[PDB]
Design a protein around this ligand. Structure first.
Ligand SMILES: OC[C@H]1O[C@H](O[C@H]2[C@H](O)[C@@H](O)[C@@H](O[C@H]3[C@H](O)[C@@H](O)[C@@H](O)O[C@@H]3CO)O[C@@H]2CO)[C@H](O)[C@@H](O)[C@@H]1O
Ligand code: CL
Ligand code: CL
Length: 372
């Protein structure tokens, strides 16, 4: 039997359907008292919401895979048991297991495959228009945010650089302090004068008002964008961009969304938390998340269900996940520093605060900063 009390943290608009998932959980485990709330600052900030006070945080919490190495090294999350590991590995696609594995051990329960795509109004742009960045932006406005390094760091990967080495595990393996890195910096700078590129902190609102024809966004907004655009909804994988005069695919990050178990829980409550984490990331639960938000399951069987297989967003995400189209977010303990330093590097190139004469120096300093 499983008993205990657990607090579950999810993102704000997910609460209603996680209550449904928890109702399903309680059909099987009637003696576990679950309290579902939003987290203080979201899954993108689990690192710091938990780290502020691990013992006060939720017992099960949503967290993106890049945060896992830091949290594992800090002792905030424990390795999954052999049986829990086997279930994750057998039930989900390979990249989901890679996403949660740190130094050979799994530290979270994966449930969604995240890659950004182009979402666009098909009354304003065609499927062919969205194939290239310059062609798209010559025909309509793309609204985006150069202060968000998750949007634009992957241009460095398109340029041929590595982030923490071949598989994201090498402390000194970021080699963006190179001519290839400078090509990406130059691309950011070029976008400031591209009249088809609108800087905004709320790209979704610009799409909704009609001031943008396209945005880059991820599947956490799939159902939201389908509702906004209605019959004008369309989606595509990322386009090509020109780097050093060559057309190359513009990458996104590939992220794996997970739930992790807070290592503070003990006794019954710990067993209840692990049971909940497993359940809310199971196939049925992944499909409920899909039904409500449009996020893409990592479960092998769910990905091949007729409804997922026929969803154009799922198809675009599957394309994005292929080699060359995205890179799995690394999970090095340094990642919080990486993100903090990457955003002003990129935005400085975009705004001109970093001029071309300083690209090499700034990239050298960046690599030193993130490689400790
Ligand atoms: O920008 C730095 C930031 O990048 C990464 O965060 C991204 C998440 O991985 C990704 O899931 C997405 O987050 C959204 C949630 O999924 C959604 O439920 C809701 O909370 O909105 C979030 C977006 O605001 O996008 C973010 C990037 O914006 C990385 O995981 C972070 O650790 C890193 O700090
Ligand atoms: Cl381009
Ligand atoms: Cl406890």
């Amino acid at each position: 039997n499983v008993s205990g009390s657990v607090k579950l943290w999810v993102d704000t608009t997910q609460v209603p359907y996680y209550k449904k998932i928890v109702a399903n959980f309680n059909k099987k485990y009637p003696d576990v008292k679950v309290k579902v709330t939003q987290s203080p600052n979201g899954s993108a900030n689990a690192k710091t919401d938990v780290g502020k006070d691990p013992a006060k945080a939720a017992d099960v919490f949503e967290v993106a895979n890049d945060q896992l190495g830091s949290m594992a090294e800090a002792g905030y999350i424990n390795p999954l048991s052999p049986d829990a590991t086997k279930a994750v590995k057998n039930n989900n696609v390979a990249v989901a297991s890679e996403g949660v594995t740190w130094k050979g051990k799994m530290f979270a329960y994966p449930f969604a495959e995240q890659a950004q795509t182009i979402y666009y109004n098909k009354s304003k742009l065609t499927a062919d228009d969205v194939k290239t960045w310059d062609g798209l932006t010559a025909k309509g406005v793309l609204a985006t945010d150069f202060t968000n390094a998750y949007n634009f760091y992957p241009v460095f990967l398109s340029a041929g650089t590595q982030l923490y080495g071949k598989t994201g595990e090498t402390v000194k393996g970021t080699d963006v302090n190179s001519a290839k890195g400078e090509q990406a910096m130059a691309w950011f700078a070029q976008q400031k004068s591209n009249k088809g590129v609108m800087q905004t902190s709320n790209a979704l609102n610009q799409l909704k008002s009609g001031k943008a024809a396209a945005i880059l966004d991820g599947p956490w907004n799939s159902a939201n964008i389908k509702k906004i655009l209605g019959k004008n909804f369309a989606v595509a994988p990322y386009p090509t961009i020109k780097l050093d005069g060559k057309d190359v695919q513009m990458q996104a990050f590939l992220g794996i969304e997970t739930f992790a178990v807070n290592s503070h829980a003990s006794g019954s409550n710990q067993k209840a938390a692990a049971t909940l984490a497993s359940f809310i990331t199971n196939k049925e639960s992944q499909l409920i998340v899909y039904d409500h938000s449009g996020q893409i399951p990592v479960d092998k069987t769910a990905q091949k269900s007729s409804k997922v297989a026929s969803d154009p967003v799922a198809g675009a995400v599957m394309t994005m996940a292929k080699p060359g189209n995205s890179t799995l977010m690394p999970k090095m303990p340094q990642m919080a520093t990486f993100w903090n330093d990457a955003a002003p590097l990129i935005n400085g190139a975009y705004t001109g605060s970093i001029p071309a004469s300083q690209y090499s120096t700034k990239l050298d300093t960046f690599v030193k900063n993130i490689s400790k």
